[PDB]
């Protein structure tokens, strides 16, 4: 479940550019 | 070119096959006196007479 | 191997050598003449300063067209430069000589460069293309370097 | 302390005056690096990508006249380089530059 630290790092993990760029949707590590 | 005749293709095949370095063990033969392959050809340096 | 100027006592001496090194002979000769006679620590510091453009080597014999600098005044001279490649090659040869001294068992804090010599090496040939269908040489001028360090305090 | 962070404003206009059009934005970052080196005494200066983008915001020749930066001197414990301290400089967006002093900032 989400929490404050989880969202705080999610904000950095989602942006992959500046204004006008598409936010990252997903990131999985799977075997 | 992409369009080529059989004779041209065979000539190019022989040139490609014979453009390779000498085997390493040749230099170990008795009275060898061959250091490298002096007949090496690069496609950009020297063009085939054909 | 045959060095010129064999040391007077080859028990307090160490040697270093390099052949066919791809640095300019003139720049290397000037750098060698600059570091000749120095302590090994002083020579290391000076070569690092030459790399950092804080001290210069004075170009005394091969100085045709070499510009002037303010750092050339410490030397009794006017024209100086900062040959980075020559400084790096001489630093590597100095490290090799220091390692040889450690192997021989003589302490490196007293080593002084008593002999250094830069010889011309066989020239490597390349090509340059000129105005009217002409070909001219574009040769390299590599050098052999040898050095003998001794202990003296 | 040696892990201090401070906030400065740089007169990029003053430092970039006279430079040609295609060299203004690169030399603005060279001058920012020089400013950080002089003010924090660390040859290792790393510029945040957001700060680089802010300097390059209006193209290569119309660099912003003033920039508000934050110099954070940090311990370079990441590796055994000769520089044990580095300075990370980051962009601080502002609305006005009037009456802004050099101020120390906490964590």
């Amino acid at each position: 479940i989400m929490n404050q630290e989880k969202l705080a790092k999610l904000q950095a993990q989602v942006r992959i550019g500046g204004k006008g760029t598409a936010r990252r949707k997903k990131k999985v590590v799977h075997r | 070119s992409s369009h080529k005749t059989f004779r041209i293709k065979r000539f190019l095949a022989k040139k490609q096959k014979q453009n390779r370095p000498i085997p390493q063990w040749i230099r170990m033969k008795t009275g060898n006196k061959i250091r490298y392959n002096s007949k090496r050809r690069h496609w950009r340096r020297t063009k085939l007479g054909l | 191997v045959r060095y010129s100027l064999d040391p007077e006592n080859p028990t307090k001496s160490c040697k270093s050598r390099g052949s066919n090194l791809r640095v300019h002979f003139k720049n290397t000769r000037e750098t060698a003449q600059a570091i000749k006679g120095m302590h090994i620590r002083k020579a290391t510091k000076y070569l690092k300063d030459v790399t950092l453009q804080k001290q210069c080597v004075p170009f005394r014999r091969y100085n045709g067209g070499v510009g002037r600098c303010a750092q050339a005044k410490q030397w009794g001279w006017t024209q100086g430069r900062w040959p980075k490649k020559s400084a790096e090659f001489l630093l590597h040869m100095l490290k090799n000589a220091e390692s040889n001294a450690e192997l021989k068992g003589l302490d490196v804090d007293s080593l002084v460069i008593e002999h250094i010599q830069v010889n011309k090496a066989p020239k490597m040939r390349r090509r340059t293309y000129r105005a009217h269908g002409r070909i001219n040489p574009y040769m390299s001028s590599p050098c052999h370097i040898e050095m003998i360090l001794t202990e003296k305090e | 302390n040696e892990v201090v962070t401070r906030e400065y404003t740089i007169n990029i206009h003053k430092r970039i005056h006279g430079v040609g059009f295609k060299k203004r934005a690169p030399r603005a970052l060279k001058e920012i690096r020089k400013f950080a080196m002089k003010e924090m005494g660390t040859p290792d200066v790393r510029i945040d990508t957001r700060l680089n983008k802010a300097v390059w915001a209006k193209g290569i020749r119309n660099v912003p006249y003033r920039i508000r930066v934050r110099l954070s001197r940090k311990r370079n414990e990441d590796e055994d380089s000769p520089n044990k301290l580095y300075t990370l400089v980051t962009y601080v967006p502002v609305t006005t530059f009037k009456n802004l002093q050099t101020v120390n900032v906490d964590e």
């Binding site: 760029t21 598409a22 990252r24 949707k25 997903k26 990131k27 999985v28 | - | - | -």
Partner: protein
């Protein structure tokens, strides 16, 4: 290390240009293991390779 091959393969799989291929700068080591187009498809599914959107060329000014 060097992801020249992976960007070329991702462009063919995504059927876009190399302009639009986004390789995750943090997961460089994982993408470098993808030497086949099947591996590229797996990375595309897992979000390590992304097709960046078309640059906005609005017609609102002309309208």
């Amino acid at each position: 290390s060097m992801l020249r091959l992976q960007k070329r393969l991702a462009s063919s799989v995504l059927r876009c240009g190399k302009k639009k291929v986004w390789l995750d700068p943090n997961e460089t080591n994982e993408i470098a293991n993808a030497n086949s187009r099947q591996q590229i498809r797996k990375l595309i599914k897992d979000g390590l390779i992304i097709r960046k959107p078309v640059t906005v060329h609005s017609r609102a000014r002309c309208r």
